């Protein structure tokens, strides 16, 4: 018989809602049918006609853990935020200590992650100066992709690469048939502008944004684009903060380049005119942009110019944020988002009419899985896929309360904001891991995913 | 129980092949499941692991019929070509006599088509000078879209519209939320060039192609594009013959315009250096282009720049073609394609490695259905869709024999060419209409489809 | 010795002001020198250090004359407006009756023009449907270029050509090495829009502008561009009214196409928010555009995107304008400009800081002469050129008084507007034809110019 | 009276040839007249109707001199090459030792240059990391512009700047209203490619070209363009070697950016398929490109896409070139060109019909002078300009003989090539400095020019 049947689902995919029931066996979708009146299942879930979507696949997560677990994030804590947030599979970036830039470091993180994570996961390897030969190694060990930075953030730990190093990395990535994602900003210009701005006595959030303007973010995007154009590797530009950058990438992919654009809920749901009340808790890199650009971004999203959405969830000890209120240059970059990503998009996007459910599923589930090659398995509900669903409730009334976060850190740029939609049940591989705010699975439940 | 079960299917969609069985009831897909070992069905079909795809949806068909049925095509004859060709639903153009440019003419064609067609169908209305108010009427009667010509072909019967008339039609179409497809060429330039070329004594197929060069085809595309840009109606440019035109449209849709590009097997599988041996049987409008352009076209197809494929199946009394061997200007335009469309794409595209099955299904099934709004119903195999499938056989060895055609006319540009892949079973709404070359259904079986 | 010496000139050319004296003999510049202290001349003019520029060459004039001289304009009257306006050579369009579309009509107009004009002149031939062979004839008789319309204005008298006819004309023009200028608008769309707008009861100036929107003007420009791209003839798009059209042409010339952009003082010095007080006296085709577009236009001018400036001077019996106040559709298109062109540019351009003298001379003297091949002779003051100068006075204070116009008609869109700069002496071929508002030469003084 | 009269000149400017005589007094053009039959001059030169053009203004010269004068070039020697080559004013780059990156270094070079140069000169200042405040100083001391490198060549002596440093330099330049020229290549990518190529055992000229491919040259151009777009300073991209780069710059200037393109006779008259016989004597940076690209370059030149031509004359001890025959990586970059620039363009451009005299004068005389603000003075022959002419002879038959060079070094990529046109008399400020191969002026004759 069947392990579980979720019935009366208004199942959503990127191209439409279909009414059916899902039959799951051995952790995967065994069948999708119009009527299950006469089939037996050990467990039965009635969706009661609510929307059911595939588990969210977040390609941009910084739980960090490892030697810095007591300062940034713990697999067993933050992965609970994912679970309640409806994010069933994450791809951990390699920014941590030790840096995931070695086969050894990689194998160790995989072992650890597998023992403490509560949702499924895939892993990135790091592409830093001088570790070129390790890339092939991590690829063979299961890494789905790699990250390189054009502008650092944690010097010594994870360094930025020069155009030549970046170019060599692009060639290796192309030869392995992997994926390379980059943080595109101009390191050198940011430094110059910081000095000019600091000298003029700027300590604002406004001063911060100006030190890393769009023209430099866009120059880096342009540069990465020109180099991929020559290397041919699949490239994803991470957290693109402005409309013009989205267009640059779109235009290029539209011309045949295997390049894609990622943005995130922080850039869509926050504006520079929130800088004053949110302060350092909104300090992220690239900077959140203007209200005017924000409008454009939302149009591009619904219209298909933004390929994927990633949270860029990443903690920072609260004591490295608070000093930012008086002097911005003393607060670190980052914002948690694992627990607020879906509800924020559902709330200000879907329930506010500026985003369709179909598109949301495309950018938060399908494309990320597709781009990394973990597709049929994650990202959709078809016969053969892992049974990763979310039963949604678009008629909720509540607020985001950062202190209730399951992650190591308890603060958020969205703290206090209203939430009108959210996943109320989330299951991975056929088992309920979170139901109405409760995680029901033990640490280690999460499996490594690849291909 | 179930009416029929097709098992061991290697089911193909635009984004991948999934292994499952299809359960159909009351003419629609009732379920898709990994295993059907213990379910009862009146009839059982074993695909034996062959590829199964949705029935092909051809948006560009000219069976014509009506008062000219004994000269161009008959619903009960040509629709049999569709059936064996794997084309389960067609959309008849309104070029016939009387012209389908009136609510009355429309209602009459629907009645007739419904009584004699063997595959399902949707209908176009015509947008000609002076019939503006009839458009709203046909829309309300179920027309899925409309056609207008920028360059005539059958003066008196179906006339070309001027930019102003075309613009007014675009506005009506936008207001109805319908679709407008156009034949884009420059009537006036073609006439001028014809005179110059005829005067120089050109009677070639080469002379023909030169009389309707790409620069004029592309100018018309550019013009239609500028007008839709202003009207906002969904626009599909029919049979685009050259790479540059495809790019123009792609660029524009890529900029936000709801415009799409259609091409067909005649333009992909035939080249001007076939002109000498095929002669007038290859004379179509727009003209088939050069071998060099042909290469580009094939790349654009696999790469996603070509949105849909339509056969542009259309007969002409064989006595209006043969005189073309000696004097090209005396042969009419047109080519049959209902029976050779899929096998030609399967043969020279899929089985020759320059086209993926996934993409083929996208341009021959999904997009056409989607663009006209008959989607979930036709174009895919999901729970709720009409059970329209094709069991394929990509390991065939045979030739196309025009004399075996089931249509009124028995000739083809592809006559004699090899066929290595073809549908071997085709069913619409759960019933086998054609099995290994035999039509098994009576005239009238076809239903009207809309929305 | 020398016939005349103009000393203490601050001589302006497109690339700078140089301080010197001009020595003229036998109607042409015989020398330019830093000091003329010891040379004898029959007559001596002291510019006293004021700016001296070449006579303005206006390529877009509609004095009309001929059988309609008592209704539109007379050579001996309007050419006096040119003289005081600083326009030393004009190129008469062929829109008149009889139409200058024949060798005979051309020879007759040349004879007449030569007997009554007071400034020098060049002539256009007409390119209308069916007169293709006359073009070669007029070219050989001295025509500098030809005009064709894509949207009519005086049906029966001068007709618009279709794309095919226009294309054939382009080929003839290329083969003769002549110039073709066109009025680019979409005839058919304008008609459709007129009907829609009239039906909704529009009788405004606003209603007028909307009936011939920019999208149709720009479509025509795009179309002409595509056809010249194929023909290779020198093309000048006349009176371009909007920024986007200027860009389209600029982009194309920038890509190697021998195409150029013309605009005029009516489009730079008038805005739609002047429509209410100026009414029908501002009704011209293409329509004057918005204030926002006006700003762009001025930038493009100073920046080099606008190649030439032409007045498009053309009268209309005042009784065909006045009824326009109540019903716009009953007023004819056109505006006088021969007497207000330079002063308007000098006043609102140069003296207002948004246009440099150097650029003004480039677009009003040099380029027009250059494009038509009458260059060294007209358009500059070099050794060998006709001595055509203007002594300017950029420190004037006065108003334009249409009733003082020397032309047949006495009204203007600029009537009442202030004038702070104007030519105060104008001479052609070494003789003063106008000095401080007085014409001093008899009818017939004007010579035919060509090459 | 007059110091000298050059009569029967067929005087050429960017827009045409005019027949006249030039009267010079006190080193400048005092008059230009059609006939000088009755004027007295101390000296009389009869051009006999040959073409007369302004002295060539070369903006890209590396005589170097200073502490390295016995190794690279001497002002009194190389300036003689300029004189016979028809180059009347040069602008010395600041790459030398000590580097011209200081007010002191600048003042010293000016003193020296003024005492030993034989043709007139202007000076560049250097923009290197850390000397930002010196720029304002050199500007005030008369520097016409500054140079910065994006890819080094002489590390330690002249360093490349990072994007931030380059950006700060752009801002200073904009604020001073000066000019900044840059060497645009990607330093870091070149290094990476060098390693890959050397490892594969490449020691070719072919191997060299591949180590600094067009994609990296063009990326740097793109980058400089984006930064100027933001800074607004006048920018000239030096020695652009390929068609695509020319287009990138052209497109940008065409969009309003004050950016310009420079190329030189080495890139137009040499091709990679000359690499084998010329070897290291053709090794320059950026590398000379392919024959196919060469064709494009020549079209762009005559068509106006290339703004200026500079020789990039620069010596290298012959012992640092010869080892290049066996191992390319051991030969230095550079090529002499002061003596072969004009004759090479005259010979393979003008006398071969692919370049007009008018355009040649525009890119070799007018624009360079204009862009640096030394215009009316240098670059043309108008009343008030320095009398700098060249009497040309386009009917010569001879070969370039590097051993006859007047410069310190005696070798050239053009050695042995035919010369069919060349200046046969060259004068600066009214005095003959070179006549038929003989320099007739003493060292120090050259004056400093500025503004
Ligand atoms: Zn980042
Ligand atoms: Zn991140
Ligand atoms: Zn057609
Ligand atoms: Zn058709
Ligand atoms: Zn007009
Ligand atoms: Zn006109
Ligand atoms: Zn250089
Ligand atoms: Zn150099």
From Swiss-Prot, chains A, B, C, D:
Specify which residues bind Zn(2+) 1 according to the UniProt entry for this protein.
60, 62, 147, 312
Its cofactor is: Zn(2+)
Q: Name one GO cellular component term.
A: cytoplasm
Q: Write down the Pfam families for this protein, in alphabetical order.
A: Amidohydro_1
Q: Which GO terms describe its molecular function?
A: allantoinase activity; cobalt ion binding; zinc ion binding
Chain residues that bind Zn(2+) 2 = 147, 183, 239
| Chain positions with N6-carboxylysine modification | 147
- InterPro entries referenced in this protein's UniProt entry, alphabetically: Allantoinase, Amidohydro-rel, DHOase/Allantoinase_Hydrolase, Metal-dep_hydrolase_composite, Metal_Hydrolase
What the entry lists under SUPFAM superfamilies is as follows: Composite domain of metallo-dependent hydrolases, Metallo-dependent hydrolases
- Function recorded in the entry: Rather more predominant for the cleavage of aryl- than for alkyl-hydantoin derivatives. The stereoselectivity of this enzyme depends on the substrate used for bioconversion: strictly L-selective for the cleavage of D,L-5-indolylmethylhydantoin, but D-selective for the hydrolysis of D,L-methylthioethylhydantoin.
The record's subunit annotation is:
Homotetramer.
Name-wise, this protein is L-hydantoinase
> Could you tell me which species this protein originates from?
Paenarthrobacter aurescens
């Amino acid at each position: 018989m069947f392990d579980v049947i979720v019935k009366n689902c208004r199942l959503v995919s990127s191209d439409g809602i279909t009414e059916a029931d899902i039959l799951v066996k051995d952790g995967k979708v065994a069948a999708i049918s119009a009527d299950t009146s006469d089939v037996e299942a050990s467990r039965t879930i009635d969706a009661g006609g609510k929307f059911v979507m595939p588990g969210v696949v977040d390609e941009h997560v910084h739980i960090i853990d490892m030697d810095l677990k007591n300062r940034y994030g713990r697999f067993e804590l933050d992965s609970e935020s994912a679970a309640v947030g409806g994010i069933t599979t994450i791809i951990e970036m390699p920014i941590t200590f030790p840096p995931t830039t070695t086969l050894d470091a990689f194998l160790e993180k995989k072992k650890q992650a597998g023992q403490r994570l509560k949702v499924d996961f895939a892993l990135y390897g790091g592409g830093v100066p001088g570790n070129l030969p390790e890339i092939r190694k991590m690829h063979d060990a299961g890494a789905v992709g790699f990250k390189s930075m054009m502008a650092a953030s944690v010097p010594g730990m994870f360094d930025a690469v020069s155009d030549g190093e970046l170019f060599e990395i692009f060639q290796e990535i192309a030869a392995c048939g992997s994926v390379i994602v980059v943080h595109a900003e101009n390191e050198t210009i940011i430094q110059a502008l910081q000095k000019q701005i600091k000298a003029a006595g700027g300590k604002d959030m406004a001063a911060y944004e100006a030190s890393q303007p769009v023209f430099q973010e866009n120059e880096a995007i342009q540069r990465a684009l020109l180099l991929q154009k020559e290397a041919g590797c699949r490239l994803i530009v991470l957290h693109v903060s402005n409309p013009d950058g989205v267009e640059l990438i779109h235009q290029a992919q539209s011309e045949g380049q295997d390049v894609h654009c990622e943005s995130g809920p922080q850039y869509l749901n926050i504006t520079t005119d929130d800088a004053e009340r949110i302060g350092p808790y909104m300090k992220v890199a690239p900077p959140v942009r203007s209200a005017e650009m924000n409008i454009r971004l939302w149009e591009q999203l619904e219209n298909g110019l933004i390929d994927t959405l990633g949270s860029d969830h990443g903690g920072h000890p609260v004591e490295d944020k608070e000093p930012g209120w008086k002097d911005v240059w003393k607060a670190g970059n980052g914002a948690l988002g694992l627990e607020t990503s879906l509800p924020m998009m559902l709330t200000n996007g879907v329930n506010k009419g500026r985003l369709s459910l179909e598109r949301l599923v495309e950018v938060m589930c399908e494309k990320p899985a597709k781009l990394f090659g973990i597709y049929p398995q994650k990202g959709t509900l078809q016969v053969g896929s892992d049974a990763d669903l979310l039963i949604l409730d678009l008629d909720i009334d509540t607020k985001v309360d950062a202190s209730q976060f399951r992650s190591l850190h308890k603060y958020s740029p969205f703290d206090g904001m209203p939430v009108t939609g959210a996943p109320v049940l989330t299951m991975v591989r056929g088992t309920v891991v979170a139901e109405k705010g409760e995680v029901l699975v033990e640490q280690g439940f999460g499996q490594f995913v690849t291909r």
